[PDB]
Design an enzyme around this catalytic site. Sequence first.
Site, PDB file in Angstrom:
ATOM      1  N   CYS A 109       0.841  -1.202   0.000  1.00 27.05           N
ATOM      2  CA  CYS A 109       0.000   0.000   0.000  1.00 27.05           C
ATOM      3  C   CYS A 109       0.874   1.249   0.000  1.00 27.05           C
ATOM      4  O   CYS A 109       1.624   1.491   0.952  1.00 27.05           O
ATOM      5  CB  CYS A 109      -0.942   0.023   1.217  1.00 27.05           C
ATOM      6  SG  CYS A 109      -1.941   1.541   1.428  1.00 27.05           S
ATOM      7  N   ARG A 112       0.019   4.642   2.821  1.00 23.81           N
ATOM      8  CA  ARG A 112      -0.043   4.456   4.272  1.00 23.81           C
ATOM      9  C   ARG A 112       0.348   5.687   5.090  1.00 23.81           C
ATOM     10  O   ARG A 112       0.317   5.605   6.323  1.00 23.81           O
ATOM     11  CB  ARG A 112       0.839   3.282   4.678  1.00 23.81           C
ATOM     12  CG  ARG A 112       0.312   1.935   4.247  1.00 23.81           C
ATOM     13  CD  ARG A 112       1.314   0.900   4.603  1.00 23.81           C
ATOM     14  NE  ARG A 112       2.376   0.846   3.618  1.00 23.81           N
ATOM     15  CZ  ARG A 112       3.529   0.229   3.824  1.00 23.81           C
ATOM     16  NH1 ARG A 112       3.754  -0.362   4.991  1.00 23.81           N
ATOM     17  NH2 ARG A 112       4.462   0.209   2.876  1.00 23.81           N
ATOM     18  N   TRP A 281      -9.168   6.208  -0.970  1.00 25.61           N
ATOM     19  CA  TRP A 281      -9.448   6.850  -2.246  1.00 25.61           C
ATOM     20  C   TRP A 281      -8.478   6.297  -3.272  1.00 25.61           C
ATOM     21  O   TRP A 281      -7.630   5.454  -2.966  1.00 25.61           O
ATOM     22  CB  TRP A 281      -9.372   8.378  -2.159  1.00 25.61           C
ATOM     23  CG  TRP A 281      -8.131   8.895  -1.547  1.00 25.61           C
ATOM     24  CD1 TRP A 281      -6.929   9.104  -2.169  1.00 25.61           C
ATOM     25  CD2 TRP A 281      -7.950   9.285  -0.182  1.00 25.61           C
ATOM     26  NE1 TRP A 281      -6.013   9.599  -1.273  1.00 25.61           N
ATOM     27  CE2 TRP A 281      -6.613   9.720  -0.046  1.00 25.61           C
ATOM     28  CE3 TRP A 281      -8.782   9.300   0.941  1.00 25.61           C
ATOM     29  CZ2 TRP A 281      -6.092  10.164   1.170  1.00 25.61           C
ATOM     30  CZ3 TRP A 281      -8.266   9.747   2.146  1.00 25.61           C
ATOM     31  CH2 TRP A 281      -6.936  10.172   2.253  1.00 25.61           C
ATOM     32  N   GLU A 286      -4.606   3.679 -10.814  1.00 24.53           N
ATOM     33  CA  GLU A 286      -5.418   2.471 -10.720  1.00 24.53           C
ATOM     34  C   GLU A 286      -6.498   2.471 -11.797  1.00 24.53           C
ATOM     35  O   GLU A 286      -6.690   1.467 -12.499  1.00 24.53           O
ATOM     36  CB  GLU A 286      -6.028   2.357  -9.329  1.00 24.53           C
ATOM     37  CG  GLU A 286      -5.040   2.333  -8.162  1.00 24.53           C
ATOM     38  CD  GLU A 286      -5.787   2.144  -6.830  1.00 24.53           C
ATOM     39  OE1 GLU A 286      -6.440   1.075  -6.666  1.00 24.53           O
ATOM     40  OE2 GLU A 286      -5.741   3.067  -5.972  1.00 24.53           O
TER      41      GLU A 286
HETATM   42  C1  HEM Z   1      -5.938   6.637   1.866  1.00 28.97           C
HETATM   43  C2  HEM Z   1      -6.013   6.339   0.568  1.00 28.97           C
HETATM   44  C3  HEM Z   1      -5.360   5.050   0.010  1.00 28.97           C
HETATM   45  C4  HEM Z   1      -4.678   5.044  -1.138  1.00 28.97           C
HETATM   46  C5  HEM Z   1      -4.422   6.296  -2.006  1.00 28.97           C
HETATM   47  C6  HEM Z   1      -4.204   3.694  -1.377  1.00 28.97           C
HETATM   48  C7  HEM Z   1      -3.449   3.268  -2.458  1.00 28.97           C
HETATM   49  C8  HEM Z   1      -3.154   1.944  -2.745  1.00 28.97           C
HETATM   50  C9  HEM Z   1      -2.761   1.357  -4.019  1.00 28.97           C
HETATM   51  C10 HEM Z   1      -2.574   2.112  -5.364  1.00 28.97           C
HETATM   52  C11 HEM Z   1      -2.587   0.041  -3.826  1.00 28.97           C
HETATM   53  C12 HEM Z   1      -2.167  -0.991  -4.905  1.00 28.97           C
HETATM   54  C13 HEM Z   1      -3.345  -1.956  -5.082  1.00 28.97           C
HETATM   55  C14 HEM Z   1      -3.513  -2.251  -6.545  1.00 28.97           C
HETATM   56  O1  HEM Z   1      -2.830  -1.586  -7.374  1.00 28.97           O
HETATM   57  O2  HEM Z   1      -4.323  -3.151  -6.880  1.00 28.97           O
HETATM   58  C15 HEM Z   1      -2.856  -0.260  -2.433  1.00 28.97           C
HETATM   59  C16 HEM Z   1      -2.782  -1.483  -1.798  1.00 28.97           C
HETATM   60  C17 HEM Z   1      -3.322  -1.845  -0.557  1.00 28.97           C
HETATM   61  N1  HEM Z   1      -3.849  -1.011   0.425  1.00 28.97           N
HETATM   62 FE1  HEM Z   1      -3.829   1.039   0.228  1.00 28.97          FE
HETATM   63  N2  HEM Z   1      -4.664   2.896  -0.328  1.00 28.97           N
HETATM   64  C18 HEM Z   1      -5.394   3.690   0.549  1.00 28.97           C
HETATM   65  C19 HEM Z   1      -6.030   3.266   1.710  1.00 28.97           C
HETATM   66  C20 HEM Z   1      -5.991   2.024   2.320  1.00 28.97           C
HETATM   67  C21 HEM Z   1      -6.716   1.608   3.517  1.00 28.97           C
HETATM   68  C22 HEM Z   1      -7.655   2.583   4.250  1.00 28.97           C
HETATM   69  C23 HEM Z   1      -6.390   0.321   3.795  1.00 28.97           C
HETATM   70  C24 HEM Z   1      -6.812  -0.650   4.920  1.00 28.97           C
HETATM   71  C25 HEM Z   1      -7.597  -0.305   5.960  1.00 28.97           C
HETATM   72  C26 HEM Z   1      -5.463  -0.111   2.770  1.00 28.97           C
HETATM   73  C27 HEM Z   1      -4.852  -1.353   2.656  1.00 28.97           C
HETATM   74  C28 HEM Z   1      -4.249  -1.809   1.491  1.00 28.97           C
HETATM   75  C29 HEM Z   1      -3.958  -3.190   1.151  1.00 28.97           C
HETATM   76  C30 HEM Z   1      -4.257  -4.373   2.106  1.00 28.97           C
HETATM   77  C31 HEM Z   1      -3.393  -3.206  -0.082  1.00 28.97           C
HETATM   78  C32 HEM Z   1      -2.841  -4.347  -0.979  1.00 28.97           C
HETATM   79  C33 HEM Z   1      -3.191  -5.789  -0.680  1.00 28.97           C
HETATM   80  C34 HEM Z   1      -3.040  -6.624  -1.927  1.00 28.97           C
HETATM   81  O3  HEM Z   1      -3.910  -6.531  -2.836  1.00 28.97           O
HETATM   82  O4  HEM Z   1      -2.057  -7.400  -1.995  1.00 28.97           O
HETATM   83  N3  HEM Z   1      -5.252   0.953   1.909  1.00 28.97           N
HETATM   84  N4  HEM Z   1      -3.192   0.926  -1.819  1.00 28.97           N
HETATM   85  N1  LIG Z   2      -6.513 -10.480 -11.640  1.00 28.49           N
HETATM   86  C1  LIG Z   2      -5.566  -9.701 -11.947  1.00 28.49           C
HETATM   87  N2  LIG Z   2      -4.756  -9.144 -11.039  1.00 28.49           N
HETATM   88  C2  LIG Z   2      -4.919  -9.208  -9.694  1.00 28.49           C
HETATM   89  C3  LIG Z   2      -5.128 -10.419  -9.031  1.00 28.49           C
HETATM   90  C4  LIG Z   2      -5.283 -10.449  -7.649  1.00 28.49           C
HETATM   91  C5  LIG Z   2      -5.215  -9.261  -6.923  1.00 28.49           C
HETATM   92  C6  LIG Z   2      -5.005  -8.051  -7.579  1.00 28.49           C
HETATM   93  C7  LIG Z   2      -4.926  -6.758  -6.800  1.00 28.49           C
HETATM   94  C8  LIG Z   2      -6.310  -6.232  -6.408  1.00 28.49           C
HETATM   95  N3  LIG Z   2      -6.134  -5.332  -5.250  1.00 28.49           N
HETATM   96  C9  LIG Z   2      -7.245  -4.361  -5.184  1.00 28.49           C
HETATM   97  C10 LIG Z   2      -6.955  -3.254  -4.187  1.00 28.49           C
HETATM   98  C11 LIG Z   2      -6.558  -3.557  -2.897  1.00 28.49           C
HETATM   99  C12 LIG Z   2      -6.303  -2.536  -1.987  1.00 28.49           C
HETATM  100  C13 LIG Z   2      -6.421  -1.207  -2.367  1.00 28.49           C
HETATM  101  C14 LIG Z   2      -6.831  -0.880  -3.659  1.00 28.49           C
HETATM  102  N4  LIG Z   2      -6.954   0.420  -4.096  1.00 28.49           N
HETATM  103  C15 LIG Z   2      -7.339   1.469  -3.344  1.00 28.49           C
HETATM  104  N5  LIG Z   2      -7.070   2.640  -3.727  1.00 28.49           N
HETATM  105  C16 LIG Z   2      -8.092   1.259  -2.058  1.00 28.49           C
HETATM  106  C17 LIG Z   2      -9.172   0.464  -1.743  1.00 28.49           C
HETATM  107  C18 LIG Z   2      -9.351   0.642  -0.380  1.00 28.49           C
HETATM  108  C19 LIG Z   2      -8.395   1.525   0.105  1.00 28.49           C
HETATM  109  O1  LIG Z   2      -7.581   1.902  -0.961  1.00 28.49           O
HETATM  110  C20 LIG Z   2      -7.082  -1.918  -4.557  1.00 28.49           C
HETATM  111  C21 LIG Z   2      -4.850  -8.027  -8.960  1.00 28.49           C
HETATM  112  C22 LIG Z   2      -5.329  -9.396 -13.380  1.00 28.49           C
HETATM  113  C23 LIG Z   2      -5.623 -10.069 -14.547  1.00 28.49           C
HETATM  114  C24 LIG Z   2      -5.152  -9.245 -15.561  1.00 28.49           C
HETATM  115  C25 LIG Z   2      -4.585  -8.114 -14.995  1.00 28.49           C
HETATM  116  O2  LIG Z   2      -4.701  -8.207 -13.619  1.00 28.49           O
END
Ligand code: HEM
Ligand SMILES: N=C(Nc1cccc(CCNCc2cccc(NC(=N)c3ccco3)c2)c1)c1ccco1
Lengths: 411, 411
Positions: A109, A112, A281, A286
């Site tokens: 993330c 953070r 947000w 993304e």
């Molecule tokens: C405050 C605004 C936040 C922004 C701008 C942000 C941004 C991001 C981005 C761009 C990713 C990469 C995920 C992806 O590309 O699929 C990520 C991952 C992640 N964030 Fe943050 N996030 C925010 C808030 C939070 C909050 C509030 C939590 C938990 C309470 C959190 C927990 C996580 C986790 C667990 C992952 C990645 C886990 C995974 O898919 O392997 N995030 N974040």
């Molecule tokens: N399945 C695929 N990839 C893939 C597989 C497993 C997992 C993932 C990654 C999916 N995490 C989604 C994710 C997790 C946490 C944060 C955010 N974002 C935020 N801002 C946010 C939300 C809440 C606070 O912050 C987005 C991707 C795939 C197929 C072709 C291309 O990709």
Amino acid sequence: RFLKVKNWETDVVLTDTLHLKSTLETGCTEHICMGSIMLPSVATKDQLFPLAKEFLDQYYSSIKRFGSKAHMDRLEEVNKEIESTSTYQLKDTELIYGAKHAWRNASRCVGRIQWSKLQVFDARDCTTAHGMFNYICNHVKYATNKGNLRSAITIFPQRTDGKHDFRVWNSQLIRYAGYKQPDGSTLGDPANVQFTEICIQQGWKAPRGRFDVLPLLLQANGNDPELFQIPPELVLEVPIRHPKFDWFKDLGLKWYGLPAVSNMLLEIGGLEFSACPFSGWYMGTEIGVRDYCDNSRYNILEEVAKKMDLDMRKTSSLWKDQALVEINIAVLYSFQSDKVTIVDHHSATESFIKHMENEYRCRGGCPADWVWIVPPMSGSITPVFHQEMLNYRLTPSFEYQPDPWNTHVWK
Amino acid sequence: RFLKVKNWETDVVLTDTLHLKSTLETGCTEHICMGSIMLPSVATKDQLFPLAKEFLDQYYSSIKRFGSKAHMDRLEEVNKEIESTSTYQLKDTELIYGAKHAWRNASRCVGRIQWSKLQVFDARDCTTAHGMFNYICNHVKYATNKGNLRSAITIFPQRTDGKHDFRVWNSQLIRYAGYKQPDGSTLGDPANVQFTEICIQQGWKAPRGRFDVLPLLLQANGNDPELFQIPPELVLEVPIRHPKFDWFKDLGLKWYGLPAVSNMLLEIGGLEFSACPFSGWYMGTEIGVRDYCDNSRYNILEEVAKKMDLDMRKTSSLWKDQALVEINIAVLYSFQSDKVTIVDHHSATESFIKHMENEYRCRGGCPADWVWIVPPMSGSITPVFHQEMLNYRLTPSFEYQPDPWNTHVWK
Ligand code: HEM
Ligand SMILES: N=C(Nc1cccc(CCNCc2cccc(NC(=N)c3ccco3)c2)c1)c1ccco1
Ligand code: HEM
Ligand SMILES: N=C(Nc1cccc(CCNCc2cccc(NC(=N)c3ccco3)c2)c1)c1ccco1
Ligand SMILES: C[C@H](O)[C@H](O)[C@H]1CNc2nc(N)[nH]c(=O)c2N1
Ligand SMILES: C[C@H](O)[C@H](O)[C@H]1CNc2nc(N)[nH]c(=O)c2N1
Ligand SMILES: [Zn+2]
């Protein structure tokens, strides 16, 4: 045992001792590194007290009452309840600490720097899928805040036996639908084509278009899940236009304001919360890069390059790179003109380096996954490309969990 | 023990058994992953025969004569020479095999689809810094080939005692000079400001401009190194213009055709070649993104955005991303209009996935470092972003080595 990480742009060097407090494993060995594998992989009462004592010892070491009377009584109190019920219950205070530090420890993330500004909604009194729907609506409304987005998490009853898990089956509370066609191609979002079929298999009447908000599939205390439609007034959406190209409106794209991830597992002192939707947000990329331009997603580099009139014959004209920059200028522009909270990959990655400096100073380190922190466009013109990061697993933590339609005993 | 890697764009899954043949260590443990640390870190006769036997066993297992008479005699022949001299000598054939497979095993190299088209120049008869200069000139001429670039490596005498090492002190045979100013700022290339001062400290008269080709500093058999100036007719250069923006000429940038890396260490069957300059061609982003736009390098995003007339007040206008795409369109365009071999990050990263498929099929795997394979712009619109890669160290290999001006006993 006291490793050093370097920034090869500033020559700034930080020292990491936090990694010693690390507990779980990473997947790498001395003879193989798996830092680019996507997915990195009932609890007896024996295992549960070390995890409880570990967590409680760091919670009291954080309010500056480590080992005092209040600690040792709560240590014994939890010891006794784990004897009694073979599980236990977190105080409201322990739930907020854990939840906030699960985020703090999420090495993938980039946002953070906000980890301590997090609003914890305790839904551990919930018992029915309708109550889940209610709690989730109040989450969406509160976190949206008229576009002035606020981070929040809603925490549903912890796993107990394993056969009575609370789960949100949506990957995100707000998601666009996907439908395949007779010719095979895909309307809407191709990522969600299977989940969309599950909702239809359960009675959803689909308004088969592109940006159809999916209904909520909610599973309560192990029972078969039930469909609920978020009140559309609570789903804030941003129509995407460009500050120059007026045909970008005619492209007719739109995204939702609130990213709220609902399919993960929150681990606190050995306890397992299988439903814990969390929201913040968007970083702009993304949507602009991945959602819009992944081949297997909306895949609009074809169409945007056409309207830009580009050399689409040669790979080496960088017409893909050209259309990707404009698409992310538009997403940012659209979101900010509507007063909806978004962050650009430059501002976001700068804040993470500044966040990293704070963690190494007042905490001894900051677990970070470079493969995920570096944005999916323009990598090296952001300061995280040039920053060495140590990855390691700390707890409390967010974990992946299997999709419940493979786990669940159906009726 | 038979791990799987996946491509999350095609759902293509490949199985890796090659990693079992892995020997050296990576820096990661079960409890920490160091896949984003930049730098990943005399040989007795006892250690030398296992490494010799290992290498020879795979060399004969490659020409389909594994264990035959010719193998066992060469196994005994090398055994006897390591008894005799405590070191040994590679056949010309063993030198080409090793050298080619050092490249094949370079997990950070995206161009390895070419690994078997490599021209090995044996300079193990060289004894003087003048002879090094001669061999290196013939390398540059041959590899340049009037812009039709050809991969080549020149291999200088192996380390023996440690105090009589052959070294090229340039980081690359062809490099632009760097000079700091009275006000502190830097003319030319800020990466090479220290090395440029070393050459001046040794008598180089600098033509203090930007794109001044540095002289060669060559150290032969441990003796203090000596300056030689590459004949300018052998240094091919590409003036950078844009296919649209005629002021891009007025920017007045130019790069050299031949990337030829001279500061690394080639390891073959336990033997150590401390001078082994190797050359191929450029992926476009090395120049357009890193050389030109790294803050600590030429740093032209400021100036290109100005001439493009961009919103340079807001970080979130992506004016940096905008000027970076044009800069890489120009670098590609300029190189191809002059018939000088270059490759764009899309073509290059596609070929690597195709290369990866060949290695997993006819070899059992392909060590790959995602942090380095993914290009430094437009990451996810190239197919390597979405490809899981297992990193592990195989031998023969290229290794980093310290800069000789810290090691060397001077006179
Ligand atoms: C405050 C605004 C936040 C922004 C701008 C942000 C941004 C991001 C981005 C761009 C990713 C990469 C995920 C992806 O590309 O699929 C990520 C991952 C992640 N964030 Fe943050 N996030 C925010 C808030 C939070 C909050 C509030 C939590 C938990 C309470 C959190 C927990 C996580 C986790 C667990 C992952 C990645 C886990 C995974 O898919 O392997 N995030 N974040
Ligand atoms: N399945 C695929 N990839 C893939 C597989 C497993 C997992 C993932 C990654 C999916 N995490 C989604 C994710 C997790 C946490 C944060 C955010 N974002 C935020 N801002 C946010 C939300 C809440 C606070 O912050 C987005 C991707 C795939 C197929 C072709 C291309 O990709
Ligand atoms: C055929 C054209 C080639 C292309 C297009 C190419 C491309 C690249 C690129 C872009 C990198 C990343 C390095 C950086 O960004 O600083 C790299 C790394 C590397 N390549 Fe290749 N390369 C080529 C030929 C070769 C040859 C001929 C050899 C050896 C004989 C070689 C060995 C290596 C090594 C050892 C590294 C990285 C080592 C390090 O700095 O950690 N390459 N290559
Ligand atoms: N010192 C920095 N980084 C850094 C430090 C140590 C090492 C490196 C990486 C430097 N490898 C250079 C290199 C190696 C191999 C191939 C190529 N290329 C080719 N095409 C080629 C040549 C021959 C065949 O193919 C380029 C970078 C720094 C400071 C600020 C920003 O970066
Ligand atoms: C194969 C590879 O691990 C995969 O593409 C990862 C790379 N890094 C990522 N980084 C982010 N933020 N999000 C992602 O989905 C991915 N995907
Ligand atoms: C800190 C980080 O490891 C460093 O920036 C690496 C990242 N990946 C890279 N990848 C390539 N090809 N070249 C580089 O110089 C780097 N630098
Ligand atoms: Zn690792």
